[PDB]
Amino acid sequence: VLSEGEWQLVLHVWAKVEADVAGHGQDILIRLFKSHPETLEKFDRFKHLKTEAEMKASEDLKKHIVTVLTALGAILKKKGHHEAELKPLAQSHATKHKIPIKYLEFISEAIIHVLHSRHPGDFGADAQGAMNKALELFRKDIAAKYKELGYQ
Numbered sequence: 027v028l029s030e031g032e033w034q035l036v037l038h039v040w041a042k043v044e045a046d047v048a049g050h051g052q053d054i055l056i057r058l059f060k061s062h063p064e065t066l067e068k069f070d071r072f073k074h075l076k077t078e079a080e081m082k083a084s085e086d087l088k089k090h091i092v093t094v095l096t097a098l099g100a101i102l103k104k105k106g107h108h109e110a111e112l113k114p115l116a117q118s119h120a121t122k123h124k125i126p127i128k129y130l131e132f133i134s135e136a137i138i139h140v141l142h143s144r145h146p147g148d149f150g151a152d153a154q155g156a157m158n159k160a161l162e163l164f165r166k167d168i169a170a171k172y173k174e175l176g177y178q
């Protein structure tokens with residue numbers, strides 16, 4: 027569903043994220059929790075962080091978000107050939123964290139927002155399109171695994 031050119035744009039933009047994973051991650055979470063405060067309730071520790079500055083000062087949050095974006099980066103670099111990487115993630119997010127697909131849509135929106143904020147010259151319509159397709163492919167495939175595990 028993505029062309030080789032689309033995957034190159036995805037990966038071009040992701041190399042930029044990789045220059046500061048923690049900083050992009052912090053911004054993505056803050057944007058998620060500002061836009062969709064219900065999502066914060068899924069994080070037993072982070073939900074007690076009262077302000078954007080407390081969130082940026084949390085080493086726990088920073089460590090966590092780097093783990094998250096490392097997993098996302100690994101999946102993107104597979105250019106759709108990501109079943110083996112998705113399987114465990116679907117398993118923990120369906121069975122333990124209980125994350126609905128619409129919250130993966132919310133975080134997808136925050137990713138696009140933060141990448142456009144930081145890298146507008148390397149993130150125009152074609153690049154936004156390709157990342158949107160790549161994040162949609164990730165969610166569709168996670169959604170299929172959710173069903174196989176018996177989660178709604």
Ligand code: HEM
Nearest residue numbers: 065068069093094097098114115118119123125129130133
């Ligand atoms: C790009 C989409 C996401 C990716 C790549 C991702 C990735 C990860 C990874 C690698 C971990 C640690 C291992 C694990 O338990 O599976 C994790 C844990 C976690 N994830 Fe996600 N996640 C995504 C979306 C979300 C969303 C949208 C939420 C909530 C609204 C969520 C909530 C959690 C929670 C609550 C944990 C456990 C944190 C802890 O207490 O240690 N995840 N995620």
